Amino acid sequence: SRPILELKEKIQPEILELIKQQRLNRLVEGTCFRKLNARRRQDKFWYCRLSPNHKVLHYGDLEESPQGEVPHDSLQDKLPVADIKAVVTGKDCPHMKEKGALKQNKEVLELAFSILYDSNCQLNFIAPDKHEYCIWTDGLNALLGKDMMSDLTRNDLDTLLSMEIKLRLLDLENIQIPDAPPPIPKEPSNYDFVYDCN
Amino acid sequence: TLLLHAELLQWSDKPCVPHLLQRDSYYVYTQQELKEKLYQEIISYFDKGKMWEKAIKLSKELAETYESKVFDYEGLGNLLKKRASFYENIIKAMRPQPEYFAVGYYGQGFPSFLRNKIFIYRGKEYERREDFSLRLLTQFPNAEKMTSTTPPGEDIKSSPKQYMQCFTVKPVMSLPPSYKDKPVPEQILNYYRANEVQQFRYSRPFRKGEKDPDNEFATMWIERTTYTTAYTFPGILKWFEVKQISTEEISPLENAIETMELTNERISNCVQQHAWDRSLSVHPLSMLLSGIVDPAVMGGFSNYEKAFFTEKYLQEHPEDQEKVELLKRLIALQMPLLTEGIRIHGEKLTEQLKPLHERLSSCFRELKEKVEKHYGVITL
Amino acid sequence: MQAIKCVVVGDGAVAKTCLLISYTTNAFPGEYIPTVFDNYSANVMVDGKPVNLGLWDTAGQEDYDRLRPLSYPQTDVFLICFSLVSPASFENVRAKWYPEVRHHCPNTPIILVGTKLDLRDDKDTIEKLKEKKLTPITYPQGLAMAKEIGAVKYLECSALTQRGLKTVFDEAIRAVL
């Protein structure tokens, strides 16, 4: 399968592309995110929609919406990407370094992500579980145009690559691909087509 | 809009054409009855739309039609009671003035209508231009603008990657008909300072002259950015294009004129708003008078003396110096205006204002005699 | 309706009056008109209700400390003002503008603001200050001074460029809100 694997893993471009596209769609659709330590009647649900323009983030101190996102220009409708330095994830989050009343507990370490914008104010966020957290940071890295850091993302990429190479190889069944590609037959150096083109 | 529809209708006694016979409900529907429905809803709108001027302006001929055809005497009376309600709302209730913006969407990236044309926008009553441009960034992709606030962005006249440009333009005054001769109370003006507005302008401070440090005044020029809106503000659409834009210019004399004019108009403004008011803080009086008594940051008294009143500016302008005498007139009516300021201060004068009013009387009569001699005014 | 009195206190060597009138001008950056008046006041909402906002311009002159202790009583808030790249402004505030205001009224919300933040990181002005052996006041310096006095909020915005300026005044208005 060595030539087959060469052929397969050489034509990547579109697979990670589509996975990142899906991540982007996930951020655009968005859902109710969690604030910090939503305890004293604080909204553990509030939405953050990536723009239809993909230029603003519809994040705002919205209420406990079990449905999910409510569509409007949120309490903080703007989050341009031109200034998004990064997102601190895990212990790197300032909300994970808080030792005051907002001290995030030990059950939010993987729910730790705060978008770096303005270099001082971080969208100190908490996730409902690991997978959507990884997807959020994935899509944000897609806004940064970098790699996807969900384990399930690499799952999707490998399985799509395997299925795709599976769904191409049909015709060369009963035939082999030499590791060195079979010799290109010497074309007639004259471009002369005795019968017309097409 | 509903009116525009009713505008098509006539008070005729009959159901005339079924085209206007709407599909929400349908029976005989004689024209005057339809206008009656429409006018009911229109007046309801205006009542909840706060535009009771329109409410009354229609209710008049509404009752006219009542009596003239139908004798809806019950409707006559209730309609007129509502008219009374509207008038009371007018005199009593006060209304805020929305900030106004002539908006240039620049970029071939905008649609054909959305590109390179100055759309005058009726914002909200108290809009900050920054939040306005913010929602434009919400409005459009490519959240970036021109710092070319005054001039157009020619590159982004035909470039993609839409740019923008905005600012709070001047709401040009309304024209209260037959009220200019009339000492009308304020309610008409407050209702007119930001509504029924089609002309607009934004400020263009400019430095055309000798930019010496103390004087900003022989250089200060305002290239007023005159606008005409195609349609009334308010109107069928909040925003609108500029129907016609015009730049302007303002000479060092004319800009001295306007500085002292805004000075005096704000003096008169605070004085008069205090005059008919009684539940007013005297802090603004302290503001005005404490600022006036000291031509402090720069001696605007002395600044105008040097810039225009003195001989050097006769050197700049011998023939057309008959406006620095007009600056003398401006101050010479300012200090009687400052005198009504003194009056309102004194009638609302307190213990900590007492040293303040001491300085008021003292230095103010000082500037009085000073303009009578040094500034060369011929007072009243 | 509400009217807030605020005695702005800080040195005139930084020319905060430019910033204040520019905001009152609400100007496009660099397009404001400074005036001859003092104590520029206006009326802008932040939320729910506009406020008759009064920004008393007490210039940097220390002599006016004869009647600025009349401005301190019965004043809703105060704007204590310094420049981050004018160290003399820093020390003058902590020596005159901070203490005199603090002690004339040890009970009033107080907001320390760092002027010329645009020049706090200005390589040319900073290298001048180092050549002039002047320390560019960084964010931690003002942070420490704030937690020293417990100013209701310490800030640093821009005058020529109006950056954070509108936000700074927004929190200034919401301070009594």
mmCIF file of all heavy atoms in Angstrom, chain C residues 51-73:
data_model
loop_
_atom_site.group_PDB
_atom_site.id
_atom_site.type_symbol
_atom_site.label_atom_id
_atom_site.label_comp_id
_atom_site.label_asym_id
_atom_site.label_seq_id
_atom_site.Cartn_x
_atom_site.Cartn_y
_atom_site.Cartn_z
ATOM 1 N N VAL C 51 -26.946 62.397 31.515
ATOM 2 C CA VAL C 51 -26.529 63.085 32.732
ATOM 3 C C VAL C 51 -26.007 64.467 32.373
ATOM 4 O O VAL C 51 -25.285 64.625 31.385
ATOM 5 C CB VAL C 51 -25.455 62.286 33.494
ATOM 6 C CG1 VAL C 51 -24.223 62.097 32.630
ATOM 7 C CG2 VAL C 51 -25.063 63.013 34.764
ATOM 8 N N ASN C 52 -26.375 65.467 33.169
ATOM 9 C CA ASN C 52 -25.741 66.774 33.056
ATOM 10 C C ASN C 52 -24.341 66.678 33.640
ATOM 11 O O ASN C 52 -24.133 66.915 34.834
ATOM 12 C CB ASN C 52 -26.565 67.838 33.772
ATOM 13 C CG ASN C 52 -27.930 68.018 33.157
ATOM 14 O OD1 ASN C 52 -28.077 67.994 31.937
ATOM 15 N ND2 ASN C 52 -28.941 68.202 33.998
ATOM 16 N N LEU C 53 -23.376 66.344 32.794
ATOM 17 C CA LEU C 53 -22.032 66.003 33.226
ATOM 18 C C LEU C 53 -21.207 67.278 33.308
ATOM 19 O O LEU C 53 -21.168 68.062 32.355
ATOM 20 C CB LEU C 53 -21.434 64.961 32.271
ATOM 21 C CG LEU C 53 -21.265 65.312 30.784
ATOM 22 C CD1 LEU C 53 -19.933 66.011 30.470
ATOM 23 C CD2 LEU C 53 -21.563 64.145 29.844
ATOM 24 N N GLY C 54 -20.602 67.509 34.458
ATOM 25 C CA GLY C 54 -19.835 68.722 34.687
ATOM 26 C C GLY C 54 -18.398 68.398 35.020
ATOM 27 O O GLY C 54 -18.103 67.856 36.084
ATOM 28 N N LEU C 55 -17.505 68.748 34.101
ATOM 29 C CA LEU C 55 -16.081 68.462 34.238
ATOM 30 C C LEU C 55 -15.374 69.778 34.555
ATOM 31 O O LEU C 55 -14.934 70.497 33.655
ATOM 32 C CB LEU C 55 -15.533 67.800 32.977
ATOM 33 C CG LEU C 55 -16.324 66.576 32.509
ATOM 34 C CD1 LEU C 55 -15.764 66.025 31.206
ATOM 35 C CD2 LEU C 55 -16.361 65.500 33.582
ATOM 36 N N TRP C 56 -15.273 70.083 35.848
ATOM 37 C CA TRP C 56 -14.629 71.299 36.332
ATOM 38 C C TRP C 56 -13.138 71.312 36.019
ATOM 39 O O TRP C 56 -12.373 70.515 36.573
ATOM 40 C CB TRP C 56 -14.842 71.447 37.838
ATOM 41 C CG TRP C 56 -16.273 71.425 38.295
ATOM 42 C CD1 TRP C 56 -17.173 70.409 38.148
ATOM 43 C CD2 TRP C 56 -16.936 72.438 39.057
ATOM 44 N NE1 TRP C 56 -18.370 70.750 38.728
ATOM 45 C CE2 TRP C 56 -18.248 71.990 39.298
ATOM 46 C CE3 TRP C 56 -16.551 73.692 39.545
ATOM 47 C CZ2 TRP C 56 -19.174 72.746 40.012
ATOM 48 C CZ3 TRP C 56 -17.476 74.444 40.248
ATOM 49 C CH2 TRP C 56 -18.772 73.970 40.470
ATOM 50 N N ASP C 57 -12.716 72.224 35.142
ATOM 51 C CA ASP C 57 -11.316 72.360 34.744
ATOM 52 C C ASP C 57 -10.586 73.239 35.754
ATOM 53 O O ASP C 57 -10.510 74.465 35.632
ATOM 54 C CB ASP C 57 -11.211 72.936 33.337
ATOM 55 C CG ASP C 57 -9.773 73.090 32.865
ATOM 56 O OD1 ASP C 57 -8.848 72.618 33.556
ATOM 57 O OD2 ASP C 57 -9.571 73.702 31.795
ATOM 58 N N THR C 58 -10.034 72.590 36.773
ATOM 59 C CA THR C 58 -9.044 73.242 37.614
ATOM 60 C C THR C 58 -7.662 73.005 37.020
ATOM 61 O O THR C 58 -7.127 71.893 37.099
ATOM 62 C CB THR C 58 -9.121 72.721 39.046
ATOM 63 O OG1 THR C 58 -9.063 71.289 39.043
ATOM 64 C CG2 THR C 58 -10.408 73.186 39.705
ATOM 65 N N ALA C 59 -7.093 74.046 36.421
ATOM 66 C CA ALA C 59 -5.821 73.927 35.728
ATOM 67 C C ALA C 59 -4.713 73.497 36.686
ATOM 68 O O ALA C 59 -4.886 73.451 37.908
ATOM 69 C CB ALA C 59 -5.453 75.250 35.058
ATOM 70 N N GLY C 60 -3.554 73.185 36.110
ATOM 71 C CA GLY C 60 -2.436 72.696 36.893
ATOM 72 C C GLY C 60 -1.882 73.683 37.893
ATOM 73 O O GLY C 60 -1.100 73.282 38.761
ATOM 74 N N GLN C 61 -2.263 74.954 37.792
ATOM 75 C CA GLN C 61 -1.752 75.971 38.698
ATOM 76 C C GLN C 61 -2.117 75.644 40.142
ATOM 77 O O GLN C 61 -3.289 75.441 40.473
ATOM 78 C CB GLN C 61 -2.295 77.340 38.291
ATOM 79 C CG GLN C 61 -3.807 77.382 38.114
ATOM 80 C CD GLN C 61 -4.255 78.433 37.114
ATOM 81 O OE1 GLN C 61 -3.486 79.317 36.739
ATOM 82 N NE2 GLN C 61 -5.504 78.337 36.673
ATOM 83 N N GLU C 62 -1.099 75.582 41.002
ATOM 84 C CA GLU C 62 -1.326 75.244 42.401
ATOM 85 C C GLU C 62 -1.881 76.425 43.181
ATOM 86 O O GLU C 62 -2.453 76.238 44.259
ATOM 87 C CB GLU C 62 -0.024 74.763 43.041
ATOM 88 C CG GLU C 62 0.936 75.894 43.381
ATOM 89 C CD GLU C 62 1.637 76.466 42.160
ATOM 90 O OE1 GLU C 62 1.451 75.924 41.051
ATOM 91 O OE2 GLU C 62 2.363 77.471 42.310
ATOM 92 N N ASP C 63 -1.709 77.646 42.665
ATOM 93 C CA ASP C 63 -2.183 78.822 43.385
ATOM 94 C C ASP C 63 -3.691 78.778 43.567
ATOM 95 O O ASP C 63 -4.216 79.237 44.587
ATOM 96 C CB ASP C 63 -1.778 80.093 42.642
ATOM 97 C CG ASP C 63 -2.490 80.239 41.317
ATOM 98 O OD1 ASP C 63 -2.897 79.207 40.747
ATOM 99 O OD2 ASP C 63 -2.650 81.383 40.848
ATOM 100 N N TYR C 64 -4.402 78.209 42.596
ATOM 101 C CA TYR C 64 -5.854 78.145 42.635
ATOM 102 C C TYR C 64 -6.343 77.238 43.754
ATOM 103 O O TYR C 64 -7.554 77.056 43.918
ATOM 104 C CB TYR C 64 -6.399 77.681 41.287
ATOM 105 C CG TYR C 64 -6.808 78.815 40.379
ATOM 106 C CD1 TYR C 64 -5.855 79.644 39.805
ATOM 107 C CD2 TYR C 64 -8.146 79.076 40.118
ATOM 108 C CE1 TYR C 64 -6.220 80.685 38.977
ATOM 109 C CE2 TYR C 64 -8.522 80.114 39.287
ATOM 110 C CZ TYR C 64 -7.555 80.918 38.723
ATOM 111 O OH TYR C 64 -7.921 81.957 37.899
ATOM 112 N N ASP C 65 -5.412 76.682 44.536
ATOM 113 C CA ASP C 65 -5.747 75.918 45.729
ATOM 114 C C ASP C 65 -6.333 76.785 46.832
ATOM 115 O O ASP C 65 -6.514 76.299 47.952
ATOM 116 C CB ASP C 65 -4.511 75.173 46.242
ATOM 117 C CG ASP C 65 -4.861 73.958 47.084
ATOM 118 O OD1 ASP C 65 -6.061 73.711 47.319
ATOM 119 O OD2 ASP C 65 -3.930 73.239 47.499
ATOM 120 N N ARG C 66 -6.598 78.063 46.560
ATOM 121 C CA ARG C 66 -7.410 78.854 47.474
ATOM 122 C C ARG C 66 -8.904 78.598 47.296
ATOM 123 O O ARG C 66 -9.629 78.521 48.294
ATOM 124 C CB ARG C 66 -7.095 80.348 47.333
ATOM 125 C CG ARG C 66 -7.693 81.059 46.123
ATOM 126 C CD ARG C 66 -6.979 80.662 44.840
ATOM 127 N NE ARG C 66 -7.478 81.390 43.681
ATOM 128 C CZ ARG C 66 -8.502 80.992 42.939
ATOM 129 N NH1 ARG C 66 -9.076 79.828 43.182
ATOM 130 N NH2 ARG C 66 -8.908 81.726 41.914
ATOM 131 N N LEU C 67 -9.386 78.443 46.062
ATOM 132 C CA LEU C 67 -10.804 78.194 45.848
ATOM 133 C C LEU C 67 -11.092 76.832 45.240
ATOM 134 O O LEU C 67 -12.267 76.490 45.067
ATOM 135 C CB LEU C 67 -11.428 79.281 44.961
ATOM 136 C CG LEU C 67 -11.254 80.715 45.463
ATOM 137 C CD1 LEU C 67 -11.776 81.712 44.440
ATOM 138 C CD2 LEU C 67 -11.943 80.892 46.803
ATOM 139 N N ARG C 68 -10.069 76.045 44.911
ATOM 140 C CA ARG C 68 -10.328 74.641 44.624
ATOM 141 C C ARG C 68 -10.772 73.872 45.867
ATOM 142 O O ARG C 68 -11.514 72.890 45.703
ATOM 143 C CB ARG C 68 -9.110 73.985 43.952
ATOM 144 C CG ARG C 68 -8.018 73.506 44.880
ATOM 145 C CD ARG C 68 -6.876 72.832 44.140
ATOM 146 N NE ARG C 68 -6.010 73.765 43.431
ATOM 147 C CZ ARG C 68 -6.032 73.949 42.118
ATOM 148 N NH1 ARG C 68 -6.894 73.276 41.370
ATOM 149 N NH2 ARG C 68 -5.199 74.808 41.553
ATOM 150 N N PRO C 69 -10.400 74.241 47.102
ATOM 151 C CA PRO C 69 -11.055 73.626 48.266
ATOM 152 C C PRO C 69 -12.481 74.093 48.484
ATOM 153 O O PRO C 69 -13.085 73.720 49.495
ATOM 154 C CB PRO C 69 -10.159 74.040 49.443
ATOM 155 C CG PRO C 69 -8.891 74.461 48.841
ATOM 156 C CD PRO C 69 -9.265 75.071 47.540
ATOM 157 N N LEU C 70 -13.019 74.943 47.612
ATOM 158 C CA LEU C 70 -14.463 75.080 47.494
ATOM 159 C C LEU C 70 -15.016 74.161 46.423
ATOM 160 O O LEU C 70 -16.152 73.690 46.540
ATOM 161 C CB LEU C 70 -14.855 76.523 47.171
ATOM 162 C CG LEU C 70 -14.536 77.589 48.212
ATOM 163 C CD1 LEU C 70 -14.881 78.959 47.664
ATOM 164 C CD2 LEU C 70 -15.300 77.312 49.493
ATOM 165 N N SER C 71 -14.223 73.898 45.386
ATOM 166 C CA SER C 71 -14.618 72.953 44.355
ATOM 167 C C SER C 71 -14.677 71.529 44.888
ATOM 168 O O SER C 71 -15.526 70.745 44.453
ATOM 169 C CB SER C 71 -13.647 73.043 43.177
ATOM 170 O OG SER C 71 -13.833 74.248 42.457
ATOM 171 N N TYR C 72 -13.793 71.181 45.823
ATOM 172 C CA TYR C 72 -13.805 69.834 46.389
ATOM 173 C C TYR C 72 -15.083 69.525 47.157
ATOM 174 O O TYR C 72 -15.670 68.457 46.915
ATOM 175 C CB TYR C 72 -12.570 69.619 47.271
ATOM 176 C CG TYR C 72 -11.266 69.685 46.523
ATOM 177 C CD1 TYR C 72 -10.288 70.597 46.876
ATOM 178 C CD2 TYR C 72 -11.022 68.853 45.446
ATOM 179 C CE1 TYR C 72 -9.100 70.664 46.202
ATOM 180 C CE2 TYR C 72 -9.837 68.919 44.756
ATOM 181 C CZ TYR C 72 -8.876 69.828 45.138
ATOM 182 O OH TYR C 72 -7.687 69.903 44.457
ATOM 183 N N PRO C 73 -15.561 70.366 48.076
ATOM 184 C CA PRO C 73 -16.828 70.062 48.744
ATOM 185 C C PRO C 73 -17.974 70.014 47.748
ATOM 186 O O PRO C 73 -18.004 70.766 46.771
ATOM 187 C CB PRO C 73 -16.997 71.220 49.734
ATOM 188 C CG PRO C 73 -15.630 71.725 49.956
ATOM 189 C CD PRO C 73 -14.939 71.573 48.643
#
